[PDB]
Design a protein around this nucleic acid. Sequence first.
RNA 1: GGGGCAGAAAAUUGGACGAU
RNA 2: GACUUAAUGUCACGGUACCCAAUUUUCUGCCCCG
Lengths: 660, 1282
Amino acid sequence: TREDIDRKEAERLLDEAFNPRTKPVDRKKIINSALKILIGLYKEKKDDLTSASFISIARAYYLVSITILPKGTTIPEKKKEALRKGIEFIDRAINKFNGSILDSQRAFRIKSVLSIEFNRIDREKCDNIKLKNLLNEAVDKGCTDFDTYEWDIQIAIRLCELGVDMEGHFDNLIKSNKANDLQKAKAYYFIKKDDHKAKEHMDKCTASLKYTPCSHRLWDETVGFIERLKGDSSTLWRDFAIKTYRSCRVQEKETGTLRLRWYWSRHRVLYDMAFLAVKEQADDEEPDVNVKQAKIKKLAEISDSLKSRFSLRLSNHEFKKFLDKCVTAYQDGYVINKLLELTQVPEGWVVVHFYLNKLEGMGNAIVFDKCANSWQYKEFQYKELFEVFLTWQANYNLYKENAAEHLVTLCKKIGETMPFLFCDNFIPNGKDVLFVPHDFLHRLPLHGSIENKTNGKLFLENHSCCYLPAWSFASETSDEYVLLKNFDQGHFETLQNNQIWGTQSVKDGASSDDLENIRNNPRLLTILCHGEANMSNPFRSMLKLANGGITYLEILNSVKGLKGSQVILGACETDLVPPLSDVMDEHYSVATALLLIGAAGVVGTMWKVRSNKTKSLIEWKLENIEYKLNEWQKETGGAAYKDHPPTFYRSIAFRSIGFP
Amino acid sequence: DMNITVELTFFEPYRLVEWFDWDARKKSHSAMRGQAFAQWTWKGKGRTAGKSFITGTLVRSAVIKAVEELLSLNNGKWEGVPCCNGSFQTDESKGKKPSFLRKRHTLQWQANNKNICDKEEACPFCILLGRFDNAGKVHERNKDYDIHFSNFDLDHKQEKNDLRLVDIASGRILNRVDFDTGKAKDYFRTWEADYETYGTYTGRITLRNEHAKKLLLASLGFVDKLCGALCRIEVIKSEDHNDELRKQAEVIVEAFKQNDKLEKIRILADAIRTLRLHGEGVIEKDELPDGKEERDKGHHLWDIKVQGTALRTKLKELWQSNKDIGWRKFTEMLGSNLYLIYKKETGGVSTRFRILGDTEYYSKDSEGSDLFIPVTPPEGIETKEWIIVGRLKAATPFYFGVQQPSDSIPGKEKKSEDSLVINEHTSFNILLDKENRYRIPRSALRGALRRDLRTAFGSGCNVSLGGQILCNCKVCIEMRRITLKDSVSDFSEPPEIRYRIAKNPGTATVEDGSLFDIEVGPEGLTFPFVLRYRGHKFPEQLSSVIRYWEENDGKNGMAWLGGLDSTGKGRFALKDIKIFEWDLNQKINEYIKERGMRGKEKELLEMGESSLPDGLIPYKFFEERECLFPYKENLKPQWSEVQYTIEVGSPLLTADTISALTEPGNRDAIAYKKRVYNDGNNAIEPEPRFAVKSETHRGIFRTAVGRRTGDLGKEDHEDCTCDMCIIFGNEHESSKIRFEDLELINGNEFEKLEKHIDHVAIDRFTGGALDKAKFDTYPLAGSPKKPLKLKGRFWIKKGFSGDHKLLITTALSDIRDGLYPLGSKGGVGYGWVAGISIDDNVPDDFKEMINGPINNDYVHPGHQSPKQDHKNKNIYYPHYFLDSGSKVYREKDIITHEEFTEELLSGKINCKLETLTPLIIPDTSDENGLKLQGNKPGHKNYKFFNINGELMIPGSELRGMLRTHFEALTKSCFAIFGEDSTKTLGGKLDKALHPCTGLSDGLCPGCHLFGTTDYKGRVKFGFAKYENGPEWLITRGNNPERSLTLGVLESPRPAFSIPDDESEIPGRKFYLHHNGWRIIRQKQLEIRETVQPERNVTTEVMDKGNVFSFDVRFENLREWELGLLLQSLDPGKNIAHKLGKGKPYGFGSVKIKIDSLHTFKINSNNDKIKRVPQSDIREYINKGYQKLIEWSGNNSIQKGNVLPQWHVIPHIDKLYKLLWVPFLNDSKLEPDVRYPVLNEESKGYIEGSDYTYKKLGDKDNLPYKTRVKGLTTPWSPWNPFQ
RNA sequence: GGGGCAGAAAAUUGGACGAU
RNA sequence: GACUUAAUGUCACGGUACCCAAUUUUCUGCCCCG
Ligand SMILES: [Zn+2]
Ligand SMILES: [Zn+2]
Ligand SMILES: [Zn+2]
Ligand SMILES: [Zn+2]
């Protein structure tokens, strides 16, 4: 009494895979086997197959879609394709029916959940009206048993979200056990329309979010709920966005590196909404003065947490294998197997934190003054600045020497769009400034800004500037002035004759092994190789030594003898990183790599520089190490932008990256 | 206003996209992708036919880009009048944005017009831009347009119906290939339309000004790439035949099914497809292979009566009825229809649906973030255009994959998701034009160039689709300045068919469901090659790649473009490179007069330098190979070649089984052949050259490495980083080593290069040939004294570690010693490798890396019946029977071929075969090898079996005789048995003794060692070679002094062996040892007269004392099995074997002496050759004897280490009595062993011994049971019966 | 007084890692 | 002159149908009574 073509084996397999008694790692292969069995059965009987097999196929497709996570910022195509195939199979099953009650209820349940997932992923193909009609028809069919399946819970919550009234099913929805706290909060907000029970429930939901990894649907549901609460002009989203940002930070502290690159990078919207939440307080209404500064300090703290976290995570061959895995993961490939406070700054120093508000299309600049112990902030726009930066980059990548006019235009645009860099109240005159830019301002030279006046003045002529990718790079011996040179052209015969060094300087033909074996922690290291920065795959950057040695990963692996050192290098080093940064805020230059291994200060060049400028800098540096770069740049002729653009172009390319 | 008319001509296949005005475009991704393609509109319902056109906006954009580039060269001072920069910017608040937004880099210059452009006065650039006009963003009337661009309409000759989209365009699937894996990630489908007939468009501009006419006219001749193809614009002053073939295929199917031969129609359809290469003469003058001479039925395939008449006549009438449609189309349609009807009758259509794949991703997300990036080149460096012309030659059979011609239909390429497809006759297809000419698509060439440039630069990016800002990496920057052209050859002959299979690593047999064919093109074919670079200076990397693709004396071209690159398919060499230079700063007028060199590149290639057009100059600054830094540092060291010559001292055979049914000869298997196209003579070849497919090379190397390292036995390769998955690749990575074909290079030193070898299966009971169990083999003549040299190469990618090179060298060495044979029938001595030789051109690391007789002393007492009656007067029967009753041992678990197990042993045995009586082995290739048919018609003259003029014993005979001895020794099943009428013969046999069928019930010792149909054997035999002796037993009185004329040899009759059905089958049949050949020798003068010259044969006859040497190779053997094989090779003294013709007459006695046995072990460090002295051998026979005793069921002999007495087991005792020679050790025993003739008064009568069948089987005396008892008991006297 | 066997049995496509 | 474009802005010459698989396994050119 058994049919020759039965699908009970696949139904049992899917039922066993449904319950949370199976390993997450082993869930995919078994459901793939069940799908293979079902597809073979479908191929055996083309169009005479029964409806129940189609229902099981659609269920398997829905599950295979839910077992796929949205890595990065772009969702993989396999999830969308699986949903499309599942909805097509469910439509085919619905069109012709044998006639049943449970079969129809299950078919409409699967169709409804597939449509909900499809609309959540994209709204263009499945608009809100068709989803509303389909879901209303499904709820008419009678799928309201809330104590058995969570798909009905999802149907009810989405029905509440869409607009219709469900005042009748509220008590049985609340009495159900399968629903979680976020769904309870949505039900309390969209039916009872009260703000206390929903607050408590989603507060417990947020408190339970500290252990969920950054791959569950719960993060996306929380983001969407808070976004809709913001959209309805509610007065209930600021604090909850703050606490979900706290939970996101806590989970961020307990995640892997590849997962930090793939799955954690889609929480920029969460880090932005919480930034807006804090920015909404400290406003026209006047509380005590100290809470203003506390709120601004919190704003700087949250803007700091979105900075370069991948680089902060940095027996010999294990590290090399990990670095190869990281670099092969950067190109969307397969990877087959004691913190300083924001206040602790030296006296006479001002720190500027940059954050590009992507949600509102605005820029924020937070400033802390040590002498006054004051916190200030200002806003600006960055669209035309981005356009001029891209124009300069495009011209330089093609001509590399006649784009000085574009550099002057970019400096003038920076001065125009940021008028607070010259204000007395914002940044005091005769002070030292520190820059922590964000997401495209690393490439712009902020020490070349010209104010919009009759005869503008550079930013260097009054302030000395320093650079730092993030505040996490700030911390808190010998006297050998080691030198490494590989300049084949010559023109440095007047430098090697100095006796300030000894027993470690490779005057000619310096190679990678000459730098790998350094162990004295020198006070000053000088490298005079060729730059040849790499745009695509910035993990090489090809620091051209003799044998073509240390590019960018040998720095992170093969050198461990430059802790507390100051390194000045003449080559295209600190920039020519891709204009389009990344899916997350990161800086990838070998200057940053040198800063990562333990070096104190690094002087790098923003683009190609001449031999004369490097020779002048290295000769003027060793006279007394306490001089900064601003005086040398001012005396070199960097104030000649109007008459000779090329000399200004050559002079500005140097940059300091070390915070003392 | 002059109303100028512009006519557009294409020179490359352009692209088509269905038309959606502005809102339906956002819904369909295909329309959004193809904004810059030709547009197709439907005219009438049914989606059958329509019209094609090119929008005026695309032409306007092309003209705007043209004027931008033209003014950038002259600093905006075209013909003396300044020009401004333009705007190219629209504010979204004050006015509506244009329908198309810009993403490229706008070229800008210094504003030298000293004025601001308005309606009153403006530069010609503003007038062409339409910046200041009465019309904008809304079309109301045509009079206000200062500049206009009307739509362009196609020009067609036939206008009875509409354009009928089917013949104008053909859809195809393009691809995206990831760099570091070599596999595709996504695909997309576009329509391509031909240019030979539908490639002309016409339209009007209707310019209402004369100030900018001089710029507009010059800008017309500057646009080159429009609608995805090269172009120039200048001004002007039958499915009914399918139905009939389907009905005829149906009647052919019914006729084939009526004869219970349904499965042969697949091979019939394949042969019909193969016949497409031959002309109509193969069916006109009846050139199809015929049947065997003097046979009732002819060919087993071409002589099947279909509706009474033969198949050839029906095919002739079918071709005559459908002569109009052509020969190629008729053959292809007949094959496809036959395949479809056969599949429908079988019960499946092979839908082949895909799960969680088939990603079709289009570049999508440009609503915001609009930018305008100006690029201002300096007033210095000039811009020049370089044109590169040459020819591409295929050094290997190329392959460009396309989808089946059912999904390539324009209008219905895809209906919806979950649309099961139908597999056509051929799984893999090749790209062809509408004239059936080979094509190298621009997409494949551009992708190959992109990959090569990325490798040469040393860094690059994966292509990003839908990017907001242009890529600024070096590879994209250099590729944006490169223009290529499609290449079409002048060759239209049909492609070849190459077959591929897969082998199960466990049973060493074919895999269930692995059989497919690939269409490949000929080698030596020529294709055009045009490259254009527009830039400031010629890149060094591009020139390095050009030199890398070039072929000269001492260097081979390396241009891996196409598919199936692992099997060495798609290697190209570019020759006849000529680089010319266009000066675009001072010679722009001449570049305008002739529109570059578009559409006339062939003429440029052919003409000399004296008739070069003005403006073009030869480029003499092209760099050499050794002077480029990108080359020899990043490009040259990528692939390293390793070539060698393989010497085969055996008849290598690579069967095809399909060309045999289309060529004369009537032979089952014919060696593989290839067709190569010649350049000087535009034909193919006077004679094809034999070769071995690269797939066999790759499989041999891959299985050698897998068995070396043991990764072949893993059940899965998910997340695998093993040796096999790294060197040879998997379904997620491309192979790191590429193999090429093995071509035969010394075929001109052979006369009769190919040999004819026959084969037969012998029944175990009847002792004769089995019904329908005869076949022939047609391999290449391989001999130890003259071997075949095959030259082949494989390429190694840069990045190999020391362990992988070690593995490759060990695999090559293990090929050298002769463990993996080439071709088929390796178990009988076909395609055995004698050695390899590596020339002095491989890398130095590889070249330095690659570099007492045994006696049994066992005697047998023998029978007493001839021993006591030692003088004379005793006649014995020529053959007796051995009876092992019912017990057969089935071995449930099976020794796998996946790896060399640590407990089992493998090695080689060298054996010597010496004769006891003269031997007969015929060379049946020719029927008259001595030329005696001139005087006596109908006589069969045979020589000894020889290859290239030396005597040699085939290995199949030795394998069969040892297999029979082993089967009788180990009490196994009857491997060969005839279940036919005299119940039937199969009913008499016990069920347990039936031949092994399937691996479910196990394998008997005989089938587990020598092998069965679903399990390859572990013992391989080789051809025996002659060394010494006295040859050609001389008899005075015959026309040849070395020939013997035998008697009548009639078929065996089981009726005498088994009487009426109360009896039981006796078992195996064995022949006695006796010097009965002298009786035939002394009556030649009587046998040549009393016997008609039709029922006897004359063959060259050898002599006693002649020694042959043959070897036996074995792998993965247990200890007792090896001991049993050693005992079967020689059972001791006074016991020998029988082999050859004339066994009943005592004409095949041979003694096998074991010389040496080497054992080699592989789970050791690398390998080692041992000697295995006599002690280990004796231990092995002792173990075999213990195994036999355990099989006997009772421990008659206690455990111990003593000389084994084989005469304790009854069946062993009987077998050794059956093989006992009575005349070896100086014994005067001369037994007489013959047959009763028929009756009295018959030739050969004894005349007084009553030794006749009349008194022997009359049932009055000598009852049936006594007759079977006498036949069963060996050496029982018959004339004095018991 | 007489010649038989001269190919038979299978495979005729499967699959194509995206992160608990 | 519709069907068939919109005009101060079209890198689609922005994308190799690519990757994986031994035409192979078993067989003596042998053989006598109506
Ligand atoms: Zn103008
Ligand atoms: Zn690029
Ligand atoms: Zn593997
Ligand atoms: Zn068997």
